[PDB]
Amino acid sequence: NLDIIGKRIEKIKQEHETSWHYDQDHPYKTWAYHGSYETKSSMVNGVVRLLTKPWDIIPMVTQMAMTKEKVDTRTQEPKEGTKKLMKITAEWLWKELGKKKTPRMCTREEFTRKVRSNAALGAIKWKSAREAVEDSGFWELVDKERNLHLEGKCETCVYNMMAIWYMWLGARFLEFEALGFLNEDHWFSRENSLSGVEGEGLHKLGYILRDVSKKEGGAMYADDTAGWDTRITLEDLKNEEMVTNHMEGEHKKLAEAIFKLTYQNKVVRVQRPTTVMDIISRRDQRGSGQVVTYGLNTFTNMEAQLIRQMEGEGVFKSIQHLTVTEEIAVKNWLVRVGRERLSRMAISGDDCVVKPLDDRFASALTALNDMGKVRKDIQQWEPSRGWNDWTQVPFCSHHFHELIMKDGRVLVVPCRNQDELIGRARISQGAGWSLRETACLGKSYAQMWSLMYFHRRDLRLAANAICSAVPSHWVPTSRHATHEWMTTEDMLTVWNRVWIQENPWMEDKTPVESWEEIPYLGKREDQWCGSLIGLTSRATWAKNIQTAINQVRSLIGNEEYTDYMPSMKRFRR
């Protein structure tokens, strides 16, 4: 307790010596409260909304632009049988992930190149992080903490709640220096991890789920966890920490300090309106950078799902206690079939799809519930409902269609309800957007649609309209996945590269010569997934689209524009 966190708490105490009041009516039960002190939205993208008029009267779209008791919860300690299963599996999984990779420190140079590329780090003297990385004074502050961690102590690595846990750039750098390698060197790539999809891209995920469907076995299971980050136990944090067993030198010590001082023993500042700032501590639950969070969520999810698979195959009888011979059976299962069982999964942080050996998996719930990974929207002991068709499985907020081109070649495409896509593209975050910056964000959404959602009639039409309304040479902007749409290259050339040339599931590499060779879903299947095709509002929009494009061109002014509407058959004469 207070020996590891007290030094951080002491320093905050003094900075607000005038206001250090202990509010006896503090709402925390699970969080350990220390003291208080005195302290004191989604905007619409006008370019995308003017070019999607029919959606102005659809509440699922228009409500998206308008407008905890899970963090303050406790998770019971797992049984001894469960703790053994997790330790054996985690030991085995780090070794497997480490067979073709070498842990290493990430550099100030690498960090500095990420801040100048507008990468989301979650950071709180210096206005922006760019100024701080340029100032040696910042690196002087980083050095002091760096030497504190080598000494096994912490002073400034404190979380700020808002769920997102922002920290000071110095603590974020020290996290990146010690654990950035997991993402920077692609540990959770499909090639390395077999279950992972880090770096894949939305265009790949459907092909990956269809490859899992090809395995002999039972239903496809896709159970969501209720509040995954809140269910991470101190036992889970200990199993994650075993990556340090593969390290050496300074790196081993720096990594051991991140896990010990900032992950397994936290300090957090939360704003309570009654406005004051509360300084609370807790050892369990997930509270890290979003990028390290992603890789450790993937690791711990892979572990939990291999154990659920062991339970269904009868590898162990009870979570109460593993016998000596069950330990050897579990290790032997992992050595003999572990890699095959990893390939039966697609795991993206807390999100999973599993095609187990058979449907015994559906009712194998004792280890999953005892690890604290309780399923969302089903009773604790009711068996999981599986999917019989890979095209119906949810994964990473999508489902996937099999779409046959006029020339016979097969595309596997990502999809989701079209109201969600249009509603998201109509929102921008933050202040001080120029008309040009707003336009360039609309262009990013439009190019994303031409590449990923070209098969949805409304989105190919709206994408063509937005690209016709925004000056041809303006560069799309965006104030685990691949962003091929962020470019000024011709979108037909990018489509050919992504879906044909670089597609490992497409044997015939014949280029497509025009957008009219590129198919849509069935009219009925487009309506099922939210198309307005068939409505009078939509027909009038499509027919009069040049009027909408011209409205937006008149607002932006006398710039160079291209007409992309004749790429579609109906505007081709």
Ligand X SMILES: Cc1nc(C)c([C@H](C)NC(=O)C(C)C)s1
Q: Which residues are annotated as a binding site for Zn(2+)?
A: 145, 149, 154, 157, 399, 401, 415, 529
Helix, strand, or coil (residue 171):
helix
Residue numbers belonging to the annotated binding site for CTP: 227-229, 297, 376
Q: How far is the CB of 144 from Zn ion (least distance, A)?
A: 10
Which of 318/392 has CB closer to Cl ion? 392
- Residue 529 binds Zn ion, judged by CB under 5 A: yes
Which of 237/440 has CB closer to ligand X? 440
Total chain residues near ligand X (CB under 6 A): 8
* DSSP state letters, 225-269: BTTGGGG--HHHHHHHHGGGGG--HHHHHHHHHIIIIIISS--EE
Residue nearest to ligand X (CB): 481
User: In the chain, after which residues is the C-to-N distance over 2.5 Å, breaking the chain?
Assistant: 40, 67, 124, 162, 274, 479
When binding is defined by CB under 6 A, the residue of 418, 444, 468, 567 that contacts ligand X is 444
Q: How far is the CB of 158 from Zn ion (least distance, A)?
A: 8
Residue 413 φ then ψ, to 5°: -115, 145
| Residues in touch with Cl ion (CB under 5 A) | 387-389, 392
Which of 302/412 has CB closer to Cl ion? 412
Q: Could you tell me which of 531, 518, 429 has the C-alpha nearest to residue 479?
A: 429
Binding span for ligand X by CB under 6 A among 220-228, 229-237, 443-451, 496-504: 443-451
- Residue 415 binds Zn ion, judged by CB under 5 A: yes
For residues 442 and 433, give the distance between their C-alpha atoms in angstroms, rounded to a whole number. 12
Residue numbers belonging to the annotated binding site: 145, 149, 154, 157, 224-225, 227-229, 297, 350-351, 376, 399, 401, 415, 529
- Residue 237 binds Zn ion, judged by CB under 5 A: no
CA 31 vs CA 155, 158, 283: distances in Å: 20, 15, 9
When binding is defined by CB under 6 A, the residue of 173, 176, 400, 445 that contacts ligand X is 445
Q: Could you tell me which of 296, 292, 248 has the C-alpha nearest to residue 93?
A: 296
For residues 186 and 184, give the distance between their C-alpha atoms in angstroms, rounded to a whole number. 6
Helix, strand, or coil (residue 540):
helix
Total chain residues near Zn ion (CB under 5 A): 5
Site for ligand X, residues 199 to 228, rule: CB under 6 A: 202
Binding span for Zn ion by CB under 5 A among 98-106, 321-329, 444-452, 527-535: 527-535
Among Zn ion, Cl ion, ligand X, none, partner that 415 touches (CB below 5 to 8 angstroms by kind): Zn ion
Q: How far is the CB of 118 from ligand X (least distance, A)?
A: 12
Q: Please give the helix or strand (H or E) that residue 269 lies within, else none.
A: strand 268-272
- Residue 154 binds Zn ion, judged by CB under 5 A: yes
Q: How far is the CB of 44 from Zn ion (least distance, A)?
A: 26
Structure tokens at 498: 């992504």
Binding span for ligand X by CB under 6 A among 316-324, 386-394, 442-450, 455-463: 442-450
Structure tokens at 501: 């040339």
Residue numbers belonging to the annotated binding site for Mg(2+): 224-225, 350-351
When binding is defined by CB under 6 A, the residue of 339, 483, 523, 543 that contacts ligand X is 483
For residues 454 and 494, give the distance between their C-alpha atoms in angstroms, rounded to a whole number. 13
Which of 123/452 has CB closer to ligand X? 452
Q: How far is the CB of 455 from ligand X (least distance, A)?
A: 14
Among ligand X, Zn ion, Cl ion, none, partner that 483 touches (CB below 5 to 8 angstroms by kind): ligand X
For residues 140 and 146, give the distance between their C-alpha atoms in angstroms, rounded to a whole number. 10
Q: What residue has token string 């937006």?
A: 552
Among Zn ion, Cl ion, ligand X, none, partner that 452 touches (CB below 5 to 8 angstroms by kind): ligand X
Phi-psi label, residue 508: left if phi above 0, alpha if psi -120 to 50, beta otherwise: beta
**Which residues make Cβ contacts (< 8 Å) with residue 364, sequence separation at least 6?**
308, 311, 312
- Residue 19 binds ligand X, judged by CB under 6 A: no
For residues 192 and 190, give the distance between their C-alpha atoms in angstroms, rounded to a whole number. 6
- Residue 459 binds ligand X, judged by CB under 6 A: no
Q: How far is the CB of 145 from Zn ion (least distance, A)?
A: 5
Which of 369/417 has CB closer to Zn ion? 417
For residues 201 and 501, give the distance between their C-alpha atoms in angstroms, rounded to a whole number. 15
- Residue 183 binds ligand X, judged by CB under 6 A: no
**Which residues make Cβ contacts (< 8 Å) with residue 196, sequence separation at least 6?**
187, 188, 189, 190, 298, 302, 347, 348
For residues 491 and 489, give the distance between their C-alpha atoms in angstroms, rounded to a whole number. 6
The pattern of x and - marking residues 359 through 398 that bind Zn ion according to CB under 5 A reads ----------------------------------------
Which of 93/421 has CB closer to Zn ion? 421
CA 372 vs CA 252, 319, 461: distances in Å: 29, 13, 46
When binding is defined by CB under 6 A, the residue of 9, 405, 481, 512 that contacts ligand X is 481
Q: What is the Cα Rg of the chain in Å?
A: 26
State in Å, rounded, how far the first CA of the chain is from the last one: 75
Which of 71/157 has CB closer to Zn ion? 157
**Pairing between β-strand 159-161 and β-strand 268-272 as defined by DSSP bridges:** parallel
CA 563 vs CA 118, 473, 544, 554: distances in Å: 31, 13, 14, 15
Which of 45/244 has CB closer to ligand X? 45
Residue 117 φ then ψ, to 5°: -110, 5
Which residues here bind Zn ion, judged by CB under 5 A?
145, 154, 157, 415, 529
Which residues here bind ligand X, judged by CB under 6 A?
202, 444-445, 448, 452, 478, 481, 483
